Design a protein around this ligand. Sequence first.
Ligand SMILES: CCCC[C@@H](CN[C@@H](CCCC)C(=O)N[C@@H](CCC(N)=O)C(=O)N[C@@H](CCCNC(N)=[NH2+])C(N)=O)NC(=O)[C@@H](NC(=O)[C@@H](NC(C)=O)[C@@H](C)O)[C@@H](C)CC
Length: 203
Amino acid sequence: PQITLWKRPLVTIRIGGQLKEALLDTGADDTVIEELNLPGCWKPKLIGGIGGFIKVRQYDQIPVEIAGHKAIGTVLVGPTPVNIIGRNLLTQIGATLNFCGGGGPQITLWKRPLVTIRIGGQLKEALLDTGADDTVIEELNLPGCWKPKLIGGXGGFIKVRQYDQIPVEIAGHKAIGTVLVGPTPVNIIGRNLLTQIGATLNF
Ligand SMILES: CCCC[C@@H](CN[C@@H](CCCC)C(=O)N[C@@H](CCC(N)=O)C(=O)N[C@@H](CCCNC(N)=[NH2+])C(N)=O)NC(=O)[C@@H](NC(=O)[C@@H](NC(C)=O)[C@@H](C)O)[C@@H](C)CC
């Protein structure tokens, strides 16, 4: 399908025989699913997100059908806020990010989709994250008025400053919208700005 990002890119998946809903998440290295039982030897891992780290169980070589497309790979099971399909399985179903519906750059998901942005006069690197509702940038000056906000993911919540009507140029495409500033480990471009640059998921 071609999926736009006005709403969360939620899809049905089938894993261990169970239908579940999950978010197609380009900002996730790995696929993380809520507590469930899977049939194998697992090993403990820790994984991280904007709000810190959580402990998960790693299962390898698990078949997962993602809107009807077959994958077989690593699934992490644990107390994630939202079930997420990450790049390890997005690559298997041929999913790419495309600007302007395919007329602009195509970004494959073999590695993290990092791009250059311009914000507040400054050039920075940021992750294109279809699993993020909002855009979160590393501690920086945005002059002007803001509202406090807490945002979560995964590990928990961090406190950020919400600024409105901030111009952000993403790979040379102009966007303007809300930017959240706080101690994120990675600058994140979320759906609020990805929709303005016509970014779609395609597989
Ligand atoms: C689980 C909640 C939904 C998915 C998640 C994906 N964000 C990426 C951002 C990149 C990190 C800052 C992520 O957590 N990725 C993880 C997913 C876990 C995984 N294992 O793949 C990741 O790749 N982690 C890697 C690497 C982390 C960074 N590493 C590094 N900088 N070296 C890892 N292996 O631990 N989205 C979010 O965290 C966003 N949350 C949301 O959009 C919503 N919040 C909730 C709780 O649903 C909304 C209501 O606010 C944040 C940014 C606020 C807008």
